[PDB]
Amino acid sequence: DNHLSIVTLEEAPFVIVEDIDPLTETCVRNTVPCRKFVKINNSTNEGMNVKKCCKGFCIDILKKLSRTVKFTYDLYLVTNGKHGKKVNNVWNGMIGEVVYQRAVMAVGSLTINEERSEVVDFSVPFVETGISVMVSRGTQVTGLSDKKFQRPHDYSPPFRFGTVPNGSTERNIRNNYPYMHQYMTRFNQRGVEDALVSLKTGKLDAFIYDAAVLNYKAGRDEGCKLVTIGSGYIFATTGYGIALQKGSPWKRQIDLALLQFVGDGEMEELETLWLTGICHN
Amino acid sequence: TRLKIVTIHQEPFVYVKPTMSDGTCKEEFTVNGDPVKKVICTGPTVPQCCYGFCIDLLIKLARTMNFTYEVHLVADGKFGTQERVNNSNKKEWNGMMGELLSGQADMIVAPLTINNERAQYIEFSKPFKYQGLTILVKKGTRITGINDPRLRNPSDKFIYATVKQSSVDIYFRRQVELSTMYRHMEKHNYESAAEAIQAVRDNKLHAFIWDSAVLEFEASQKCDLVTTGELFFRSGFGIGMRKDSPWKQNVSLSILKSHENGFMEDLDKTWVR
Numbered sequence: 001d002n003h004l005s006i007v008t009l010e011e012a013p014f015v016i017v018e019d020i021d022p023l024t025e026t027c028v029r030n031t032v033p034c035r036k037f038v039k040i041n042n043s044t045n046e047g048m049n050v051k052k053c054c055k056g057f058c059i060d061i062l063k064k065l066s067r068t069v070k071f072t073y074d075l076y077l078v079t080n081g082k083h084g085k086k087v088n089n090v091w092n093g094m095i096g097e098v099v100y101q102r103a104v105m106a107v108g109s110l111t112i113n114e115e116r117s118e119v120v121d122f123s124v125p126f127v128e129t130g131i132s133v134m135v136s137r138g139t140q141v142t143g144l145s146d147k148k149f150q151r152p153h154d155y156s157p158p159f160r161f162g163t164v165p166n167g168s169t170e171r172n173i174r175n176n177y178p179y180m181h182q183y184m185t186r187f188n189q190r191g192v193e194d195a196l197v198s199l200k201t202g203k204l205d206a207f208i209y210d211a212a213v214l215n216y217k218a219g220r221d222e223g224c225k226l227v228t229i230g231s232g233y234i235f236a237t238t239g240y241g242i243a244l245q246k247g248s249p250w251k252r253q254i255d256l257a258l259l260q261f262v263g264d265g266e267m268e269e270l271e272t273l274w275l276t277g278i279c280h281n
Numbered sequence: 282t283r284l285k286i287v288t289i290h291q292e293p294f295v296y297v298k299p300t301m302s303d304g305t306c307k308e309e310f311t312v313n314g315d316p317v318k319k320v321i322c323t324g325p326t327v328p329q330c331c332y333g334f335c336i337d338l339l340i341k342l343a344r345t346m347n348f349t350y351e352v353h354l355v356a357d358g359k360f361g362t363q364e365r366v367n368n369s370n371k372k373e374w375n376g377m378m379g380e381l382l383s384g385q386a387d388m389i390v391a392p393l394t395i396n397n398e399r400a401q402y403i404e405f406s407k408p409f410k411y412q413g414l415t416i417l418v419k420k421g422t423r424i425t426g427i428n429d430p431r432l433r434n435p436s437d438k439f440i441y442a443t444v445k446q447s448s449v450d451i452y453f454r455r456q457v458e459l460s461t462m463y464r465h466m467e468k469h470n471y472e473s474a475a476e477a478i479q480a481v482r483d484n485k486l487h488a489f490i491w492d493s494a495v496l497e498f499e500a501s502q503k504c505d506l507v508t509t510g511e512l513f514f515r516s517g518f519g520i521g522m523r524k525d526s527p528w529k530q531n532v533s534l535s536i537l538k539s540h541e542n543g544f545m546e547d548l549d550k551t552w553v554r
């Protein structure tokens with residue numbers, strides 16, 4: 001069939017979620033319909049499917065893919081988990097929706113990695129990402145592998161740097177740089193917005209996170225005080241990719257369509273439309 | 282059977298040096314004390330020694346997935362484009378693409394750019410290196426970059442080109458928005474990146490549009506050269522395999538694993554940065 005269940009996850013500017021237009025009670029132009037299962041309370045599986053309206057960088061990718069590869073879809077937001085985590089060998093998030101066949105496709109800020117690639121097929125990456133570093137303008141650091149991060153107490157004063165815990169960034173640092181992980185947990189940030197405030201107010205020296213997210217934030221930062229390292233020093237370079245069921249018959253044509261979008265300028269136009277900001281390091 | 286690896290001379294990803302008298306490779310260590318792993322590569326009929334970024338990757342892939350290999354350099358010295366067969370209908374690929382589709386090679390291990398044109402016929406790994414296109418000039422030449430009047434309004438006074446039968450040659454011919462630039466480029470394109478880089482050093486070539494991971498390495502080694510510092514198009518290198526090859530999945534998983542455990546970080550610090 002050409003009708004596809006597709007799961008997504010809110011993370012601006014890649015996926016932005018709005019309510020239906022109250023006047024028409026439909027999704028306005030620029031946006032596509034998406035449904036979210038909303039719980040009655042935290043003490044039940046009972047809930048109500050609520051109509052919402054989704055837009056953003058990856059939603060525009062989905063529209064291009066649906067037009068080019070010729071398929072229709074029902075888009076819905078994941079409600080258990082976020083991107084995808086294996087908890088006691090059971091997947092949640094968007095990856096969980098794909099592996100357990102509730103969705104044939106996951107569209108969003110979904111990072112390609114080896115663990116997920118053993119249970120889903122990933123399209124070609126459509127934007128690059130990885131582990132990058134954001135600092136206040138004037139701070140000199142190379143990247144995640146900088147000795148100022150690896151051996152923080154070789155310097156006086158030591159760098160105050162951290163990440164948002166419980167995600168792919170913390171897991172990677174924990175495996176690659178154990179002491180750096182042990183050190184930086186004292187500077188754990190509750191969220192991206194918290195970290196930016198801590199950077200701009202001198203409470204934090206560096207923020208280590210998703211490169212695509214950090215580049216977007218730096219491009220629109222006010223006064224352009226926050227900057228990221230160069231793209232050549234991004235650690236563990238990977239990308240956002242479309243997740244599909246293992247052995248999906250949609251993977252090849254989706255790969256060819258994405259590579260077409262990259263080569264013919266359509267991809268750069270979406271980057272200009274959604275990702276590029278005033279600031280330019 | 283041994284896997285037939287095709288590659289191409291492209292520093293710092295593939296160095297090609299002559300063997301010693303006894304047919305072996307001179308033992309070397311990096312300035313930081315790491316052993317430089319070298320393999321024998323046959324090329325144009327004569328054995329030579331190959332090493333560098335992609336050779337380090339090939340060794341890691343061979344031991345991870347437990348396969349043996351033999352390395353040879355691409356016979357025609359090109360990466361690979363599709364050309365019409367004269368007085369015929371068929372199209373054929375040249376360069377490493379043709380050798381992979383012919384069976385002369387089982388796997389391409391080189392700075393092979395992933396694009397839609399090649400992915401129609403072969404399977405690409407996940408990218409082992411993210412980079413892009415930039416412009417290399419000689420120190421003393423001043424241009425804004427890709428959107429320069431000297432490049433947008435070409436003439437025989439400012440000669441710019443790329444490598445024939447390459448990803449960049451594909452990129453500028455397929456786009457109707459680049460038809461004026463490509464017409465200037467097709468009468469000046471060089472057979473190799475090395476010949477084009479030296480031409481910028483002999484002031485015969487004034488600009489060279491090529492891969493950033495190569496051009497930026499060239500600027501850091503030959504300070505009489507300099508790049509724009511701009512990335513006007515981003516692309517990735519991938520391992521090339523035939524359709525439905527038995528190694529596709531584990532090569533991609535191996536590469537993703539190498540990015541995540543810092544192995545590619547080590548390759549970058551050793552060869553690129």
Ligand SMILES: CCc1cccc(N2N[C@H](C(=O)O)C[C@@H]2C[C@@H](N)C(=O)O)c1
Pocket residue numbers: 083084109110111112129130131164165166167168169170172209210211235236238541
């Ligand atoms: C090499 C490790 C790495 C490479 C590229 C991105 C990240 N990320 N860091 C975040 C976090 O730790 O919460 C979220 C994001 C992952 C998120 N897109 C996802 O798909 O899980 C980690």
